mmCIF file of N, CA and C in Angstrom:
data_model
loop_
_atom_site.group_PDB
_atom_site.id
_atom_site.type_symbol
_atom_site.label_atom_id
_atom_site.label_comp_id
_atom_site.label_asym_id
_atom_site.label_seq_id
_atom_site.Cartn_x
_atom_site.Cartn_y
_atom_site.Cartn_z
ATOM 1 N N UNK S 1 -71.868 150.385 -8.313
ATOM 2 C CA UNK S 1 -73.029 151.091 -7.783
ATOM 3 C C UNK S 1 -72.669 152.524 -7.408
ATOM 4 N N UNK S 2 -71.727 153.106 -8.141
ATOM 5 C CA UNK S 2 -71.293 154.472 -7.885
ATOM 6 C C UNK S 2 -72.401 155.467 -8.220
ATOM 7 N N UNK S 3 -72.601 156.442 -7.341
ATOM 8 C CA UNK S 3 -73.628 157.455 -7.544
ATOM 9 C C UNK S 3 -73.009 158.836 -7.729
ATOM 10 N N UNK S 4 -73.439 159.535 -8.776
ATOM 11 C CA UNK S 4 -72.916 160.863 -9.045
ATOM 12 C C UNK S 4 -71.693 160.834 -9.940
ATOM 13 N N UNK S 5 -71.871 160.352 -11.165
ATOM 14 C CA UNK S 5 -70.772 160.271 -12.121
ATOM 15 C C UNK S 5 -71.122 160.987 -13.421
ATOM 16 N N UNK S 6 -70.992 162.310 -13.414
ATOM 17 C CA UNK S 6 -71.295 163.113 -14.592
ATOM 18 C C UNK S 6 -72.745 162.915 -15.027
ATOM 19 N N UNK S 7 -73.651 163.652 -14.398
ATOM 20 C CA UNK S 7 -75.071 163.558 -14.719
ATOM 21 C C UNK S 7 -75.369 164.206 -16.068
ATOM 22 N N UNK S 8 -76.504 163.824 -16.672
ATOM 23 C CA UNK S 8 -76.929 164.359 -17.968
ATOM 24 C C UNK S 8 -77.352 165.821 -17.883
ATOM 25 N N UNK S 9 -77.711 166.260 -16.681
ATOM 26 C CA UNK S 9 -78.131 167.634 -16.486
ATOM 27 C C UNK S 9 -78.773 167.860 -15.131
ATOM 28 N N UNK S 10 -80.082 167.640 -15.054
ATOM 29 C CA UNK S 10 -80.816 167.823 -13.807
ATOM 30 C C UNK S 10 -80.630 169.239 -13.270
ATOM 31 N N UNK S 11 -80.485 170.197 -14.180
ATOM 32 C CA UNK S 11 -80.300 171.591 -13.797
ATOM 33 C C UNK S 11 -81.614 172.360 -13.881
ATOM 34 N N UNK S 12 -82.333 172.172 -14.982
ATOM 35 C CA UNK S 12 -83.611 172.846 -15.188
ATOM 36 C C UNK S 12 -84.664 172.320 -14.219
ATOM 37 N N UNK S 13 -84.499 171.072 -13.789
ATOM 38 C CA UNK S 13 -85.436 170.453 -12.861
ATOM 39 C C UNK S 13 -85.028 170.724 -11.416
ATOM 40 N N UNK S 14 -83.710 170.965 -11.142
ATOM 41 C CA UNK S 14 -83.203 171.328 -9.788
ATOM 42 C C UNK S 14 -84.129 172.410 -9.276
ATOM 43 N N UNK S 15 -84.215 173.487 -10.102
ATOM 44 C CA UNK S 15 -85.037 174.662 -9.839
ATOM 45 C C UNK S 15 -86.474 174.267 -9.516
ATOM 46 N N UNK S 16 -87.025 173.359 -10.313
ATOM 47 C CA UNK S 16 -88.394 172.898 -10.114
ATOM 48 C C UNK S 16 -88.540 172.188 -8.771
ATOM 49 N N UNK S 17 -87.615 171.276 -8.488
ATOM 50 C CA UNK S 17 -87.642 170.525 -7.240
ATOM 51 C C UNK S 17 -87.649 171.466 -6.038
ATOM 52 N N UNK S 18 -86.936 172.623 -6.125
ATOM 53 C CA UNK S 18 -86.928 173.701 -5.104
ATOM 54 C C UNK S 18 -88.387 174.159 -4.883
ATOM 55 N N UNK S 19 -89.162 174.300 -5.989
ATOM 56 C CA UNK S 19 -90.572 174.666 -6.041
ATOM 57 C C UNK S 19 -91.422 173.678 -5.249
ATOM 58 N N UNK S 20 -91.268 172.394 -5.558
ATOM 59 C CA UNK S 20 -92.025 171.369 -4.864
ATOM 60 C C UNK S 20 -91.558 171.167 -3.437
ATOM 61 N N UNK S 21 -90.478 171.848 -3.068
ATOM 62 C CA UNK S 21 -89.928 171.740 -1.721
ATOM 63 C C UNK S 21 -89.761 173.119 -1.089
ATOM 64 N N UNK S 22 -90.641 174.043 -1.459
ATOM 65 C CA UNK S 22 -90.594 175.400 -0.926
ATOM 66 C C UNK S 22 -91.988 175.879 -0.536
ATOM 67 N N UNK S 23 -92.928 175.774 -1.468
ATOM 68 C CA UNK S 23 -94.302 176.195 -1.221
ATOM 69 C C UNK S 23 -94.920 175.388 -0.085
ATOM 70 N N UNK S 24 -94.485 174.140 0.055
ATOM 71 C CA UNK S 24 -94.997 173.265 1.100
ATOM 72 C C UNK S 24 -94.421 173.647 2.461
ATOM 73 N N UNK S 25 -93.103 173.542 2.592
ATOM 74 C CA UNK S 25 -92.428 173.878 3.840
ATOM 75 C C UNK S 25 -92.791 175.285 4.299
#
């Protein structure tokens, strides 16, 4: 159940998630 073992990317969406967690706060 190891978490964080060489992800496929999640880089282009990192930026997006900042969006969904910025305009609100």
